[PDB]
Design a protein around this ligand. Sequence first.
Ligand SMILES: CCN(c1nc(OC[C@@]23CCCN2C[C@H](F)C3)nc2c(F)c(-c3ccc(F)c4sc(N)c(C#N)c34)c(C(F)(F)F)cc12)[C@H]1CCN(C(=O)OC)C1
Ligand SMILES: Nc1nc2c(ncn2[C@@H]2O[C@H](COP(=O)(O)OP(=O)(O)NP(=O)(O)O)[C@@H](O)[C@H]2O)c(=O)[nH]1
Ligand SMILES: [Mg+2]
Length: 166
Amino acid sequence: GMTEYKLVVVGADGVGKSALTIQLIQNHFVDEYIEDSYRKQVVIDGETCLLDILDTAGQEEYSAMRDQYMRTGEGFLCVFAINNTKSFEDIHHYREQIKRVKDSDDVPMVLVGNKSDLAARTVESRQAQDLARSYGIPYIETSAKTRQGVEDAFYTLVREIRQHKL
Ligand SMILES: CCN(c1nc(OC[C@@]23CCCN2C[C@H](F)C3)nc2c(F)c(-c3ccc(F)c4sc(N)c(C#N)c34)c(C(F)(F)F)cc12)[C@H]1CCN(C(=O)OC)C1
Ligand SMILES: Nc1nc2c(ncn2[C@@H]2O[C@H](COP(=O)(O)OP(=O)(O)NP(=O)(O)O)[C@@H](O)[C@H]2O)c(=O)[nH]1
Ligand SMILES: [Mg+2]
């Protein structure tokens, strides 16, 4: 058949989880936006695959069932917004929960600084890049509005999942 990658997009409210997902999957920008899954057949490095993307929403809770559902993700996009310092400060907490339910410090993960089209940046690229380095994961800046970096962000995550097999 065709290889499938289960991706989970996580991060603080309003950082653009839905806009990034809808931009990648449906190819347009939503100005106002529900937890749901989005799927698309794509080409990464010449190989065709199916992406199954969970756009997370709702309440923070740690029931057995919620843990088990997140545990089915194979890679995680940890998203903050480059104009929202609190969303960046929360990144450590999201990585902590991923490592906990996946029971591994070697989870395919990408740090995404979204809304890079905005002028009013509060998180310098270099501080997010250095944070990603301390985690050992790539850092990619995106704009769901312009589509800049969006494919690079999700596809790099797939590449991490692939390299994480071997
Ligand atoms: C959509 C829900 N959500 C989430 N908020 C938070 O923390 C919000 C803050 C605000 C202060 C208190 N708290 C602690 C910290 F200070 C940050 N953590 C979340 C989280 F860790 C996950 C998660 C990720 C990966 C995993 F492996 C697992 S496993 C499991 N059981 C998870 C859970 N739950 C989970 C998810 C999930 F699952 F959707 F991906 C959603 C989380 C909203 C709540 C309002 N929010 C906000 O930004 O308010 C300003 C964000
Ligand atoms: N300028 C700009 N705005 C963006 C970008 N990405 C998202 N937004 C805007 O930011 C707001 C929140 O985006 P959304 O995708 O709903 O964020 P979310 O993380 O899904 N929020 P929730 O956690 O409540 O579901 C929306 O008004 C959206 O239009 C971006 O790259 N650039
Ligand atoms: Mg959303």
